[model samples]
Target chain A: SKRTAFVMGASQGIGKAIALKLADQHFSLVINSRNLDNIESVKEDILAKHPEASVIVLAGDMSDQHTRAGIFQKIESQCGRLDVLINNIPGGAPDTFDNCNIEDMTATFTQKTVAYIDAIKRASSLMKQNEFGRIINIVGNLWKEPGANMFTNSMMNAALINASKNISIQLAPHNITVNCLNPGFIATDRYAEEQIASGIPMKRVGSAEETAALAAFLASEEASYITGQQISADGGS
Target chain B: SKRTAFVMGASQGIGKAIALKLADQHFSLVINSRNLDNIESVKEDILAKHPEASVIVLAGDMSDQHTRAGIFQKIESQCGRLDVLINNIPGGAPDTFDNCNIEDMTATFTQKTVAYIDAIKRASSLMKQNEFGRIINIVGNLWKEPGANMFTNSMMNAALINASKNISIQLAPHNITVNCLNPGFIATDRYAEEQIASGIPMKRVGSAEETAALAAFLASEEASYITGQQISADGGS
Candidate 1:
């Protein structure tokens, strides 16, 4: 009987890396993204690597209520129960705060903050049924040092950090745990050359695999006593 | 002229208590709240004890943009320029996550998250002009232990916490510093007696005055090098 894990925003970058790592851990996965096209390759990649891994795709925009409802429905009906939830959504924003629009803030909230909370609500309930779960939210370095133009991501990610903490305690007695990981300057395609010049303490940015490794640990039974923490994987930045 | 310090939500609880501590440090005060009636006595108490201290009042709901604007206007016109920003606002919510409303979330965001950022934006600008400032946001212990029913506050305060970190780096070169104080189980009138039975390491809950003392130090030249940090005054809870 393999444990089931649901990872949000698993089509690319850190999310994709985490999904692959979980597959290696032998957890049957329910990976999600806005479009099936973006995630199909990821599913295929995992299958090619580990043919025995059971990977399901629940594709829809996580920010949408219908999409979120569908993801949970698939998990409950197809998987029977969930043991781990890796909430990995992309973060970072344009430097537009000087003339920031309210609509833009609202959109970011819906996409990141609201979506994460809604997913947690559904996942925690399913985990509570069995009295066991691990909830891991992948945030950004904003938890350590917020950027000037990156106000939206900084603030929204912080909200998620505390929300995770709040619920971690609520679910602690039930043997369920929640934690947040703040990845600092990972070597993703979107990372700018100038960011690398900023000089991380390790003289290099982290790999998606490195971020995934910590995610796997937090989601494992070894980390049972640890809950309500905001850890950074920034190579000591 | 004495260095001026502005403390928000200073009418009662931790904010009011912090106001008195800052007065002992000889900083001229600009204290704010929703109504003048609630804070006038606080203004009198500080002045009565330190008759030479200049204590001013700018009464308004900090959540409202107009009210927040008015506060900065008074700080500039009356106090000349703000030197220290003691961003003390109350945080904690009733256990109502079962049927939490978006409107309620928005209101909490406005009261705590949005107001803290708006004030920081204005205060940090002034501090940059002078090449010196201290912004101390007095949040709850959620920075350490986030409770179940405190989801709204846990998230909002976490926003303020990271927001403080982001700006701390941006403003560090200018000699301005930002930090957060997380007080655990203060012995306020509202704190239930049963909470003390939980057996904090010190066998006692903290007083508001103790929290204020830290605020005063952080808002001083002694703590100049410390920024982007979250310090707790929870008696080892």
Candidate 2:
């Protein structure tokens, strides 16, 4: 009677979608974002849809280690245990090479890559206690097909991929499967007409819900053996 | 007689091996390293081994854009035509995540990934003139299977793989091929006793010449159509 998932950066987009979908799957969620209001909105969105669901908000600037420590503390007390960890480390890139610098690269790595390490490592410890765990990282296609301009996206995503593979071998023995999802150009209003013309050969886009469905499947018990993988929903982009 | 190539960071190790191998392939060579004395020594080694070989040293601190610009000038003036570019961007990792930081990640990316963008883009211009070129990068297994401690290696190597694929598609239309060589755990005294115990599957080790032989084939005219591939000589380890 204990199934809980902590969705990092669940304030919006795929993270929100995953949290909403997992709630339907009957997972008590501990979700977070840097902004308190936005994270509370997500909690309310979950509760409004599923009146019986359990949702807790842990909001803070994740770049700070103290904030991360607070997240772990809140999860331990509120949820009692974490079974599934949905890491939705969000990131944005710059105007290509003209303005790309070490600061930008470091910041992007901090936001996208360095930010996820603590959550995954700590959650795995909690996972080991239960003998069942699923770790899904919201990764992207940049590591496979990098943009000519956006420098940091490829490197940070690649780091995550490597870390996933590295840790997958370690976690597999403990029944904790690690994997990634590349939500290539998800048809959020934010991307709109700007992203459609560039590459995606499908000449269309995928929804965040569509990405969530696949992620939900990975988090399911059926996908236990399918670890150390990177699946894309980019419509052949 | 105009088949000339440039090997970046060719002073020692796999870079040196590749430069020496390319010399046998009838390529008039221009090689660079950060250390002038070491680069000059590499030139002497090439000349002494094969008295007929033409080796020019384009040594400078490649982190400086001016130095990179100077490299292009040296190639343009001395070689008159460029054919192959062997990019051996050397990198080393710290003890583990204990000492890892943003500065280290940025520096590794700069030394490994950022170091190549200018060389590849500029050299491709030189190659496009003749509609024939070969770009071989010395990549590693970190992206696929990372070490638990070394952080930036995975990210930076993965970045090269991504950039290679991205640029490979662009350069393909111009008949300027691009690829990477992953020299996994080559047995040098430096890595000996230190690395073998950790995780290499095959108990044996690999030689630099063995790695160089594969790279040589990739740079050969016969391997013209073989672009956007990463061949590993890691003894299945």
Best candidate according to DockQ: 1
lDDT of 1 at B39: 95
**lDDT per model vs. reference:** 0.79, 0.77
- Candidate 2: give its CA RMSD in angstroms: 4.4
Docking class of 2: acceptable
- Give one clash count per candidate, in the order shown: 1, 0
For candidate 1, what is the DockQ? 0.37
Error of 1 at B105 (Å): 4.3
* TM score of chain A per candidate: 0.92, 0.90
RMSD for each of the candidates = 4.3, 4.4
Candidate No. with top TM-score:
2
lDDT string, candidate 2, B123-214, tens digits: 88898888989998888767443344555677667767876876787688888789988887653444334655456666666778898899
Best by lDDT: 1
Model 1 vs truth, CA RMSD: 4.3
Clashes of 2: 0
Model 2 Cα lDDT, one tens digit per residue, A91-146: 65643432455556656766767667666767888888888899998887664433
